[PDB]
Amino acid sequence: ESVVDLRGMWIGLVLLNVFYLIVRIYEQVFGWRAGLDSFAPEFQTYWMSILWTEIPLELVSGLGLAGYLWKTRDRNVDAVTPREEMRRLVVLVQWLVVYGIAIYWGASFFTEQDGTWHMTVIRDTDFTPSHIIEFYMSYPIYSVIAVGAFFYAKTRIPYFAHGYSLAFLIVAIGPFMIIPNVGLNEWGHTFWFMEFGWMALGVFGVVLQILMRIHALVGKEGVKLLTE
Amino acid sequence: ESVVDLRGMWIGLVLLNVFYLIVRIYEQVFGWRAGLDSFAPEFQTYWMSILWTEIPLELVSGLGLAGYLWKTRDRNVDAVTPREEMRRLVVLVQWLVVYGIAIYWGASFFTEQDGTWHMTVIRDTDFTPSHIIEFYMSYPIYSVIAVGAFFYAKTRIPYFAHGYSLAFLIVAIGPFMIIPNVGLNEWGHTFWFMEFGWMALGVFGVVLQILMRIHALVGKEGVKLLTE
Amino acid sequence: ESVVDLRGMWIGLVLLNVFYLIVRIYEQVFGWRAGLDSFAPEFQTYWMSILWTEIPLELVSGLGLAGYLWKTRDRNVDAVTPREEMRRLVVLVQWLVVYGIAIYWGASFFTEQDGTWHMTVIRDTDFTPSHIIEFYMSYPIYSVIAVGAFFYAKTRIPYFAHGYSLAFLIVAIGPFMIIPNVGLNEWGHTFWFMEFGWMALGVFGVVLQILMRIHALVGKEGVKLLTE
Amino acid sequence: TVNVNEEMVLSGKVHVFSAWPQAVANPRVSFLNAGEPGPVLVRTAQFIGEQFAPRSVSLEIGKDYAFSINLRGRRAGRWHVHAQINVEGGGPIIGPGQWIEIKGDMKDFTDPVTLLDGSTVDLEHYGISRVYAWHLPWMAVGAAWIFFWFVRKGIITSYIRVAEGKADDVIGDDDRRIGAIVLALTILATIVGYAVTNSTFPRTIPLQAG
Amino acid sequence: AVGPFNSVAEAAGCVQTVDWMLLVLLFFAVLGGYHVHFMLTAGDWDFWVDWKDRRMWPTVVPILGVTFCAASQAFWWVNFRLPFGAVFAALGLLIGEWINRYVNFWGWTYFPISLVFPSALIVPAIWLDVILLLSGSYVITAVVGSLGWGLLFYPNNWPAIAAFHQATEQHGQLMTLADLIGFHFVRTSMPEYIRMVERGTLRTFGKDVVPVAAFFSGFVSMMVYFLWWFMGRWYSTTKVIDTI
Amino acid sequence: AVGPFNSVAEAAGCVQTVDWMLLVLLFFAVLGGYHVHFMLTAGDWDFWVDWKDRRMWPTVVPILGVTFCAASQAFWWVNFRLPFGAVFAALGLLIGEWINRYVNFWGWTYFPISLVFPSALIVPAIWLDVILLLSGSYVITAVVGSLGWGLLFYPNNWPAIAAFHQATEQHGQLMTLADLIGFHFVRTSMPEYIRMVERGTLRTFGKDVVPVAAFFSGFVSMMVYFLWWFMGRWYSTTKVIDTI
Amino acid sequence: AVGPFNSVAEAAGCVQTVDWMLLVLLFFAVLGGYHVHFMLTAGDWDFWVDWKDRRMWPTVVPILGVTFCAASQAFWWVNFRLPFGAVFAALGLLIGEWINRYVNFWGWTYFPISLVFPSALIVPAIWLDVILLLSGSYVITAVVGSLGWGLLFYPNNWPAIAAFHQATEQHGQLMTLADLIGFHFVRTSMPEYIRMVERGTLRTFGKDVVPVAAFFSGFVSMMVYFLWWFMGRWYSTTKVIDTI
Numbered sequence A, B, C: 001e002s003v004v005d006l007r008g009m010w011i012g013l014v015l016l017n018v019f020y021l022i023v024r025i026y027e028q029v030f031g032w033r034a035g036l037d038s039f040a041p042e043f044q045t046y047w048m049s050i051l052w053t054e055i056p057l058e059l060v061s062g063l064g065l066a067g068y069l070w071k072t073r074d075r076n077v078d079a080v081t082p083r084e085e086m087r088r089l090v091v092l093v094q095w096l097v098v099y100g101i102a103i104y105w106g107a108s109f110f111t112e113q114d115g116t117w118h119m120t121v122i123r124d125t126d127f128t129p130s131h132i133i134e135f136y137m138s139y140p141i142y143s144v145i146a147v148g149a150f151f152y153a154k155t156r157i158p159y160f161a162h163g164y165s166l167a168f169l170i171v172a173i174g175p176f177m178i179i180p181n182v183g184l185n186e187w188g189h190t191f192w193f194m195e196f197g198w199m200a201l202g203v204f205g206v207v208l209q210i211l212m213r214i215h216a217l218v219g220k221e222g223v224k225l226l227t228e
Numbered sequence D: 001t002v003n004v005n006e007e008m009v010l011s012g013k014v015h016v017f018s019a020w021p022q023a024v025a026n027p028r029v030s031f032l033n034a035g036e037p038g039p040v041l042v043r044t045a046q047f048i049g050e051q052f053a054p055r056s057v058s059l060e061i062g063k064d065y066a067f068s069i070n071l072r073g074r075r076a077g078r079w080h081v082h083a084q085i086n087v088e089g090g091g092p093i094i095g096p097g098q099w100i101e102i103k104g105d106m107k108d109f110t111d112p113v114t115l116l117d118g119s120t121v122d123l124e125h126y127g128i129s130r131v132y133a134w135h136l137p138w139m140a141v142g143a144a145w146i147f148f149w150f151v152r153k154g155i156i157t158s159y160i161r162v163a164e165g166k167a168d169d170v171i172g173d174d175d176r177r178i179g180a181i182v183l184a185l186t187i188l189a190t191i192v193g194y195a196v197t198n199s200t201f202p203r204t205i206p207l208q209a210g
Numbered sequence E, F, G: 001a002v003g004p005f006n007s008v009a010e011a012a013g014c015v016q017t018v019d020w021m022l023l024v025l026l027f028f029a030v031l032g033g034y035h036v037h038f039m040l041t042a043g044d045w046d047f048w049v050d051w052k053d054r055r056m057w058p059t060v061v062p063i064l065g066v067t068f069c070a071a072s073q074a075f076w077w078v079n080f081r082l083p084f085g086a087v088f089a090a091l092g093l094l095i096g097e098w099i100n101r102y103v104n105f106w107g108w109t110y111f112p113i114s115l116v117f118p119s120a121l122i123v124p125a126i127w128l129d130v131i132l133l134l135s136g137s138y139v140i141t142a143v144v145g146s147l148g149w150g151l152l153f154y155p156n157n158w159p160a161i162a163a164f165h166q167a168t169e170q171h172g173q174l175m176t177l178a179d180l181i182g183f184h185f186v187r188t189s190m191p192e193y194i195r196m197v198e199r200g201t202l203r204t205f206g207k208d209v210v211p212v213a214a215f216f217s218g219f220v221s222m223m224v225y226f227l228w229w230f231m232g233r234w235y236s237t238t239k240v241i242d243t244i
C-alpha cells in the first residue's frame, strides 16, 4: 500500500495545538478577571468547572485508549511481515511526535507559564487558573499520549510485545513521578521544616530501539549499498 | 530416626522467655527505687553489678558457642546423607526461631522500653537501668544466638560450609553495626555540632537459601507429585 | 644488554628534588619580604613573574612529552620480545617512582605548606606566594609526569596499548579533578551560601597490572621454582 | 622600635558602626588580634571593652570600645603591625598599622610564663622535647614494621605466592606469633607511656574556651 | 526494488520523512525535560534581570545548565556521531523559555521583556560541541569542554545585560536600571532579600567577583558533565525486562 | 637460560631492585593522596595544639584517619598478604606532616613546634594491622580492628599532649599552656571561636567527655572501614576499557 | 514412601512443622528490625498523643512506615506469591509497639495509654497488599499502592484520635484533651517546643492542612517504595562469597 502514512499524525497535532490554543486564549480572557479571587463565584463557573471536568474525563480517556489498543492487539504478533512491521514502526514514530508535542505544552509552556502567575496572585488555595491547566490538564494529557505510545508499540511490534523496554517503561511511568517533583516543589516552605535529578529522556533508548529495528528490516542491499 | 526434633528449640524458647521475664520483673522491682539515682550505693548492688557480670559472661558465652561448634564440626561434610542434611536443616530453622525471639526481646521490647525511661529520669551517666538491659544484655544475647545460627549452618550444612552465604554473614555481623546506630543515636545533641537505612532482614536470603536446599532434597516425587 | 637500567630514574629524581629544593629556598628568601603585599611591584618581579612563566611552560612541557612518546611509539608493539617487554616494564616502574616523588611535592609538601601561609597573610588576591607554587607549579608538574607515565606504558607495553587500563586512565586524569577539590575548598565561605571522597590510589591497579605482566614473563621455572 | 624581648604595646578605640551591613554577621561574636606576618612579636596579653580578651567577645552595634595588646618582640626585622578584629560570620577587619622595628637575635627570645604549681617555663621551647621524644620513637617503630616484612617475603615474591595457589607461604604463624608479640608490646609501651606522662603532670585541665 | 519498500523512491522517501519525525520528536523531548529541570533549580535567576548578578547567577546557571547538554551529547555523538548535542539541548531550552517569556510573562501578565528575558547559552553550547567534534573524546570534552562552557557564560551574556547595569540616582541613592525595572513592575511575591545575589563579603579581594565565579562555574561543570554524560548513557538503554 | 633474564643473578638481581621501586613509588602514592585528603577534612585539628581538645579532635581524627589505612590494607593484604597496610599509610602521613610542620610551619613562618605538632597515629595503625594479621578476616578487622584504633587514639596521644594541658594563671583567669601558646604565637586568621572544640553542654554527665568520644570514634570507624576497604578494592582494579 | 522421609506422614508432617517455624522466625525478624528503624526515625510521633498533629505526623509516618512494608512485599510476593507482605510487617510493628506501650510505657512507668498509644497502620497496609494482589505488578503497587497508603493513614487514625481533639478551657486559654494529657502526666524530658507539630504559616490557604499533608505523604511514599522494594530484593540475596 505504502509504509509512511502521516494522516494519523496530523490529526493529533492539529487537534492538539488547537485545543491548547483555545485554552491559552480562554485563560487570556477569563484569567484576567474571573480567576483572580477564588472566593468569588465566577471562579466556580470558569475555573473550578474545568477542573472537575478534565480529571474524570482524562482518567477515562486514558483507560479508554489503553483497553482499546490491548483489545485490538495483534494476537499473532511474531508472524508480522517486514513491510507491516516497518509500517507499524512508522506509526510508532508517529505516536512519539505527538508525545513530543504533548511534552512541550505540558512540561514547558504551561509549566513556566505558572511561574509568571505566581507573580500575579497571592493564591486562594493550590488551585490557581495556572494549576488547573498545568497540573490537571497539560500534564495528564501528555502522560496519556505517553501511555498510548507505550501500549501501541507493545501491541503491534514484536520487540515491544514480549518485553517491556525499560526505556519505554520509564517513559510511560515517570510522568507519575513528576508530581512528587514539580508539584511538591511548590509546597517548599509550608511543608519544609520537617525536610542530579531523575528524568525522562528515556525516549533516547526508545528511539534507539526503533532505530535498530529499521536497520534490521533493510537488507545489506538498502543498508550498505543504497546509503553507503 | 526422625527429621523433625524440636526438643532443642523448646529448650531455648523456654530457657529464654523465662530469663527475660525474670529480668522484666527484677527491673519492675529494682528499677523503681534502687536505680533512680546512680550516685547512690544501691545502684552498685542492683544495676552496676548486672553490667560488670553480663559483658564478660556474654563475651565468653560467645567465644564458647563459637569454638564448640567449630570443634564439633562435621569434618567430612560433603559426604552428608539426604536425611541427615534434611534433619540438620531443621535444626538450622530451629536456631533461627530462637534468633527470632532473641531479636524480638533485644530489638523491640528492651529497645522501645528505653523510650519510656527517658521520660522518667534525667540520666546520671549513660548507664541507666534500661541501658544495662537493652545495650549490654538483650543485644549481646540476640547477637550471640545470631553467631550460633551462623556457625551451626557453616559446620553442619554443605552450602554454608565452603561459602559464607553473604545473607547469613550480614545477619551475623550487622548486630555489631547497630551500636553505631541505636547507640550513638542517643548522643545526638551532645555529640552533634561536629555533625534509607542499613538493616538486617538478611534472614530473607538465609531462609531463601534454606528453602532451595529443601526443594532439592525432595525428588520430583515428593515435589511436583505430593505437593502438586 | 640488561633489563634494569635506573640511569633514567636518577635523572628525574636528581633533576626534581633539586628544582624543588631551589624553590623552597627561593621562597624562603623572597617569600619573606617581596611577597608580603601584592600591590607592591617587587611582587611582580618575584612572584607574578614565576606564575606567568610556568603555566605556558608547563602547558607546553606537557603536550611536548605527549607528542614525543606517541611519535616514538613502537608501531609493532604486539611483536615485542619477553626481554624487551620486561625491560620496558622496568622503565614503566621507573616513571612511576618519579610520579611518586612528583605526588609527594605537589600534594604533600607544597600543599600543607599553604596551610601555614594562611596564618601569615590576609591575601591580596588568590595569588599568594604559596599558591603560585602549590597550584600552578607543584601540581601541574606532578600531573605531567602522571601523563608521561600513562603515555609511556600506552606506547611501549602491549596491554597498555590497545586498552586504557581504567586504573591508569584514572591516575592520569584525576589530577584535573583536584582543582575542583583542593582549589575550591578555599573559596569556601565566599562562594558558600549558594552551597567519603574521590581519590587517586589508582596506582594500586596500575602496579597490580604491572605485577601480572611480570608474573607472566617468568616461566614456571623462575616462578614456582626460583621463588618457591 | 624594639629589642628581642622588649615589651611594646599597641592600643586604641573603635566604634561599632550602626547600619551594620547585611553582608557581615552580627558582631555578637568577635576576636581581637594584632595583624603581623607570623609571630614576629609574641602577644603577652590583650584587652578590649575593659576585659582580658584571649577568647571571643561580643560587640554591640553602635557602641565604641577600647583595647590594647601587649606585644613582646621576637623576630629580627621591620613589620607593619595592625590593630585587627574579626567577626563570626564576616571575616577580618583590619585597622591602622604602623611599621614596627625589632632588632637583636631571635636566638635570645624567651617569654616566659608561670605555672599554677609555681614554676617557670620558656614557651618558645617548653614541651617540644617530650613531643619528639614520644613521636620519633614510634615513627621509627612503624618504619621498622614495614622494613621487616618487605625483606622477609618480597613484593613480587608475595604477589606471586598469592597469585599461584598460595599464600600461607607468605603468612602463617609464627608470622602471627611475631604479630601477637609486637602487638602485646605496643599495648604495653602505650600503657607505660600513658602511666608515666600521668605522673609527670598529674595536674591538668581542659582547654579553656567560650 | 528495496524490500520491504517497493521502490527506491519509497525507501529513500520514507527514510527521509522518518528522519524529520525523529529530529522533531527528539527536539522536545529534551526541551520539555530540560526545561522543567532547569526551571526548577536555576529558576529564578533566569526569570529576573535583577537576579542576574555578578556571583551567583554566572555560577549556578552554567553548573545546572551543563546537565542535559552533556546527556544530549552522550546520545547524538555516541550513537550517530552528530556534533550538535549540547546546542540541540541548549537551544531547545532557549526557545521553550523565550516563547513562554514573551507569550506569558509579557503577553499574559505584562511584565516587560527587559525584566523577564532568559540567560544566553548558545555560545557555550557551541563551544562544547566543538570540543567534542574536534577531539573525539568525551573525557577531553568533560574537561576543556566544560571549563570553556563556564567561562563563556558571562561574556556571552554581557551584550544583553550591560544595558541595564547603568546607574540611576533614586531619592539620593544609587540603583542600576535592572534593580529599578524589578522595582517598577510589581511582582506580587518577589521581595529584594529573596534575591540570592551578590551582597559582598570581607573575603572578596579584588576586583575578581566574576572571574572567580566563572572559573568555579567551569571547574564544577566538569564533574556535572561526567555524571550527566553517563546518565545520558543509562538513558539511552535498549534493555528489555521481564516483569512489572 | 633463565629467560628472559640471562642469569639467575640477573633475575634475582632485577626482581630485588624492582621490589624497592614499587615499595617506594607506592609509599607516596598513598602518603601524597592520604595527606591531601586528611588535611582537607581533619585539618586543622592536626595543625593546632589549641584544637586538640577532649571531644572533637579525639573523634574526627580517628574517623577521618581510618580511611586510607583501610584502603591500604585492602591492597597489601589482599594482593600480597603483607600485614603492614595501615602502618604503611598512617606512617606515610606522619612523615609528610612532620616534615612540613618543621620545614614550613616552623622553618618558614616560625610557629614553634609545640603549637604545630601532628596527632599520633602509629599505635592504632599497628593495632589495626595485627588484628588483620592474626584473624585473616577484614570483617573481623573492620569490627575489633577499627574499634581498637578508635580507643588507642587519645591514649597514644596523651604522652605528647598532657605537657601543654598544664594550668597557668593569666590576668586572673585560667588558661592551659596550649590555649596560651596559640594565644602567643599570632596566627593571622585563627580566632578562638573558630576552634571547633569542647565548650561544654548540659547533657554531659560525668566525667566521661573523652571515653564517649573515643568510643563513638571507634564505632563509627567500623563503618568508615568497610566502605574504605571496598574502595581499596575498586581502586585495585585491573579492568581495561574500550573508549574515552 | 518418599525419601529422605520414611512415610508421607513424615514428609507432610515435617513440611508442616517447618512452615510454622519459618512464618514465625520470619515474623520477627521483620518486627524486630522494622520496629528499631521505625522508632528511631518516626519516633516520637508514634509515642505521644500530643505529637499526633495535622501536618507532620500524618506526613512522616506514612513516609517512614512504607519502608519495611515494601521490602516485606518484595519478599513474600516475589518468592512465594503470598499477598500479605505489607500487612505482615505493619502488624508485626503494631504488636511490638503495643505490647511495649502497655507493659512498659504504662505498666513500668505509668503514663496512661491515652498518652502513649501508637499510630494505626493496618488499613493502609491492607490496601497496599491488595493493590499488589490484584495487579500482579510492583510498579503499579509502587504508584497506586503507596498513594493509597498515604491517604488512608489519617482517615484510619481519626477514629482513635478524634476523642482527644476535643476542647477544654484552661485558665482562660484553649487546650485539646491531648495537649492536656501530655501536660498532666509529666515527662521529665518532653517540653512543648520540642514537639515538631503544626504551628501555622502565612502560606496555609484553606482549610487544607491535612489533605495536602496526606497527599504529599502518598506521593513521596511512591519513591520510598521503589527504593525499598529493591532493597527487599538485595536483602533476599542467595549469593555466596569466597573470603572475609
Ligand SMILES: C[As](C)(=O)[O-]
Pocket: C075, C076, C077, C078, C161, C162
Ligand atoms: C598498537 As596495535 C594496532 O599493534 O594493537
Ligand SMILES: [Zn+2]
Pocket: A078, A162
Ligand atoms: Zn511470542
Ligand SMILES: [Zn+2]
Pocket: B114, B118, B130, B131, B186
Ligand atoms: Zn536510652
Ligand SMILES: [Zn+2]
Pocket: C078, C162
Ligand atoms: Zn595489538
Ligand SMILES: [Zn+2]
Pocket: C114, C118, C131, C186
Ligand atoms: Zn591556599
